[PDB]
Enzyme design. Structure first.
Site, PDB file in Angstrom:
ATOM      1  N   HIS A  74       0.801  -1.218   0.000  1.00 48.57           N
ATOM      2  CA  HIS A  74       0.000   0.000   0.000  1.00 48.57           C
ATOM      3  C   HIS A  74       0.823   1.253   0.000  1.00 48.57           C
ATOM      4  O   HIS A  74       1.935   1.317   0.500  1.00 48.57           O
ATOM      5  CB  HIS A  74      -0.892   0.150   1.223  1.00 48.57           C
ATOM      6  CG  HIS A  74      -1.563  -1.093   1.800  1.00 48.57           C
ATOM      7  ND1 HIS A  74      -1.397  -1.542   3.053  1.00 48.57           N
ATOM      8  CD2 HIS A  74      -2.406  -1.949   1.113  1.00 48.57           C
ATOM      9  CE1 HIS A  74      -2.109  -2.649   3.134  1.00 48.57           C
ATOM     10  NE2 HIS A  74      -2.704  -2.890   1.971  1.00 48.57           N
ATOM     11  N   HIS A  87       1.138   4.539   1.726  1.00 47.15           N
ATOM     12  CA  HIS A  87       0.669   5.266   2.894  1.00 47.15           C
ATOM     13  C   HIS A  87       0.820   6.767   2.621  1.00 47.15           C
ATOM     14  O   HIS A  87       1.600   7.197   1.765  1.00 47.15           O
ATOM     15  CB  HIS A  87       1.479   4.806   4.077  1.00 47.15           C
ATOM     16  CG  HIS A  87       1.030   3.444   4.543  1.00 47.15           C
ATOM     17  ND1 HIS A  87       0.596   3.151   5.739  1.00 47.15           N
ATOM     18  CD2 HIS A  87       1.000   2.292   3.785  1.00 47.15           C
ATOM     19  CE1 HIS A  87       0.308   1.867   5.706  1.00 47.15           C
ATOM     20  NE2 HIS A  87       0.549   1.328   4.522  1.00 47.15           N
ATOM     21  N   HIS A 142      -3.211   4.812   5.188  1.00 45.31           N
ATOM     22  CA  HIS A 142      -3.210   4.595   3.742  1.00 45.31           C
ATOM     23  C   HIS A 142      -3.587   5.898   3.090  1.00 45.31           C
ATOM     24  O   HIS A 142      -4.429   6.588   3.662  1.00 45.31           O
ATOM     25  CB  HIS A 142      -4.228   3.524   3.288  1.00 45.31           C
ATOM     26  CG  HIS A 142      -3.849   2.082   3.656  1.00 45.31           C
ATOM     27  ND1 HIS A 142      -4.644   1.041   3.882  1.00 45.31           N
ATOM     28  CD2 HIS A 142      -2.546   1.677   3.821  1.00 45.31           C
ATOM     29  CE1 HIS A 142      -3.803   0.056   4.183  1.00 45.31           C
ATOM     30  NE2 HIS A 142      -2.507   0.398   4.151  1.00 45.31           N
ATOM     31  N   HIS A 151     -11.132   1.071   2.934  1.00 47.93           N
ATOM     32  CA  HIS A 151     -10.182   0.169   2.401  1.00 47.93           C
ATOM     33  C   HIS A 151     -10.805  -0.809   1.465  1.00 47.93           C
ATOM     34  O   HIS A 151     -11.900  -1.307   1.733  1.00 47.93           O
ATOM     35  CB  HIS A 151      -9.517  -0.524   3.573  1.00 47.93           C
ATOM     36  CG  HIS A 151      -8.279  -1.286   3.167  1.00 47.93           C
ATOM     37  ND1 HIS A 151      -7.140  -0.795   2.746  1.00 47.93           N
ATOM     38  CD2 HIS A 151      -8.205  -2.652   3.067  1.00 47.93           C
ATOM     39  CE1 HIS A 151      -6.382  -1.799   2.390  1.00 47.93           C
ATOM     40  NE2 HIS A 151      -7.027  -2.913   2.576  1.00 47.93           N
ATOM     41  N   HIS A 210      -8.951   2.668  -1.274  1.00 50.28           N
ATOM     42  CA  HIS A 210      -8.271   3.883  -0.921  1.00 50.28           C
ATOM     43  C   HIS A 210      -7.320   4.028  -2.069  1.00 50.28           C
ATOM     44  O   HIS A 210      -6.910   3.020  -2.644  1.00 50.28           O
ATOM     45  CB  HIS A 210      -7.418   3.778   0.262  1.00 50.28           C
ATOM     46  CG  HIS A 210      -8.065   3.431   1.577  1.00 50.28           C
ATOM     47  ND1 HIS A 210      -7.553   2.573   2.424  1.00 50.28           N
ATOM     48  CD2 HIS A 210      -9.055   4.084   2.210  1.00 50.28           C
ATOM     49  CE1 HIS A 210      -8.157   2.713   3.560  1.00 50.28           C
ATOM     50  NE2 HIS A 210      -9.053   3.622   3.418  1.00 50.28           N
ATOM     51  N   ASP A 225      -4.425   1.674  -2.091  1.00 49.44           N
ATOM     52  CA  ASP A 225      -4.612   0.250  -1.909  1.00 49.44           C
ATOM     53  C   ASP A 225      -4.148  -0.481  -3.121  1.00 49.44           C
ATOM     54  O   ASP A 225      -4.869  -0.557  -4.102  1.00 49.44           O
ATOM     55  CB  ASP A 225      -6.065  -0.074  -1.645  1.00 49.44           C
ATOM     56  CG  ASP A 225      -6.548   0.295  -0.247  1.00 49.44           C
ATOM     57  OD1 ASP A 225      -5.811   0.376   0.725  1.00 49.44           O
ATOM     58  OD2 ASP A 225      -7.724   0.497  -0.096  1.00 49.44           O
ATOM     59  N   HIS A 283       3.880  -5.089   3.650  1.00 57.08           N
ATOM     60  CA  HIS A 283       3.423  -5.589   4.947  1.00 57.08           C
ATOM     61  C   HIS A 283       3.767  -7.025   5.302  1.00 57.08           C
ATOM     62  O   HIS A 283       4.095  -7.901   4.493  1.00 57.08           O
ATOM     63  CB  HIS A 283       1.896  -5.419   5.066  1.00 57.08           C
ATOM     64  CG  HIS A 283       1.461  -3.978   5.334  1.00 57.08           C
ATOM     65  ND1 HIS A 283       1.388  -3.303   6.473  1.00 57.08           N
ATOM     66  CD2 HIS A 283       1.025  -3.132   4.340  1.00 57.08           C
ATOM     67  CE1 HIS A 283       0.925  -2.106   6.167  1.00 57.08           C
ATOM     68  NE2 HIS A 283       0.695  -1.991   4.872  1.00 57.08           N
ATOM     69  N   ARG A 336       4.454  -3.055   9.209  1.00 55.10           N
ATOM     70  CA  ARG A 336       5.111  -2.456   8.054  1.00 55.10           C
ATOM     71  C   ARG A 336       6.480  -3.112   8.059  1.00 55.10           C
ATOM     72  O   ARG A 336       7.301  -2.839   8.954  1.00 55.10           O
ATOM     73  CB  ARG A 336       5.235  -0.969   8.258  1.00 55.10           C
ATOM     74  CG  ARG A 336       3.880  -0.339   8.135  1.00 55.10           C
ATOM     75  CD  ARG A 336       3.912   0.987   8.840  1.00 55.10           C
ATOM     76  NE  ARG A 336       2.546   1.393   9.096  1.00 55.10           N
ATOM     77  CZ  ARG A 336       2.079   2.577   8.730  1.00 55.10           C
ATOM     78  NH1 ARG A 336       2.841   3.480   8.099  1.00 55.10           N
ATOM     79  NH2 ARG A 336       0.808   2.859   8.970  1.00 55.10           N
TER      80      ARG A 336
HETATM   81 CU   LIG Z   1      -0.579  -0.392   4.563  1.00 57.50          CU
HETATM   82 ZN   LIG Z   2      -6.218   1.027   2.489  1.00 56.84          ZN
END
Ligand SMILES: [Cu+2]
Ligand SMILES: [Zn+2]
Ligand SMILES: [Cu+2]
Ligand SMILES: [Zn+2]
Lengths: 153, 153
Positions: B46, B48, B63, B71, B80, B83, B120, B143
């Site tokens: 993702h 961020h 995010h 999400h 998002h 995403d 992640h 993360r």
């Molecule tokens: Cu994330």
């Molecule tokens: Zn997200």
């Protein structure tokens, strides 16, 4: 973006966190922070074109220069957008950075977001050194640490 | 920007380099590259919001979500902007990435330039995981490694 930030990291002692704040898009931006592990004295400090740290500081390219100008010092008209000059490191090797600059910006064509802040080995001669390097890089030597300028809060 | 890069690096072995290319401003961003040091299987991928790395990946914030939707996965409506789904790690723990996306961008409000790409620990339940955390992170866990997305040649 009212605010940006860059963590400088290198192949060595030098590291620091530098912050950029622009209160309105036409305003001066303030750059403040600490760089550590420097040798005492003057060190060139610039925004380089690319935010590419795949080969460390070397992949950032040359000074950010949208106007095809020659190298100068921050107060020079004939300067590159990324010429923020010198920062001084005290005797403990610490640079308490405090610059205010109105050419660089955090928005639009002169945005420094996603490009690289670099702190140099030697002093930047501010384009006053009388040789071709002077007008290219300012004779500022190697790139001790660098970081990509990113969006902050 | 037609091109961008993120060098993904974190507190452990997990590292990689992901490239982005967008041929016209109103078309899709191609994202591709490899992460390494991953446990075999799926990992949340993702963008961020902040490209603030002072606190490592922790300071990158939530995010990137400019339109306040919840999400989702890359192909949902309600996603998002950051995403990008899950990468897959093979038994050697190398994940190769090929994503074409039409919601992130390298220009305008949706620009991911200057923000943080995060790989992640666990997999993203694509928001369809059914619980309040699912609709915020997709339960992707820690993360593991991140990078600020910079402009590249
Ligand atoms: Cu994330
Ligand atoms: Zn997200
Ligand atoms: Cu420089
Ligand atoms: Zn210069």
């Amino acid at each position: 973006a009212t605010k940006a930030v860059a963590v400088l990291k290198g192949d060595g002692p030098v590291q620091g966190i530098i912050n950029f704040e622009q209160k309105e898009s036409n305003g001066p931006v303030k750059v403040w922070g600490s760089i550590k592990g420097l040798t005492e004295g003057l060190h060139g400090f610039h925004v380089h074109e690319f935010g590419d740290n795949t080969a460390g500081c070397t992949s950032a390219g040359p000074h950010f220069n949208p106007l095809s100008r020659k190298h100068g010092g921050p107060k020079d008209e004939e300067r590159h957008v990324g010429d923020l000059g010198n920062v001084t490191a005290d005797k403990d090797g610490v640079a308490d950075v405090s610059i205010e600059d109105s050419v660089i910006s955090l928005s639009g064509d002169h945005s420094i977001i996603g490009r690289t802040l670099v702190v140099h080995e030697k002093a930047d001669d501010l384009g006053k050194g009388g040789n071709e390097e002077s007008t290219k890089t300012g004779n500022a030597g190697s790139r001790l640490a660098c970081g990509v300028i990113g969006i902050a809060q």
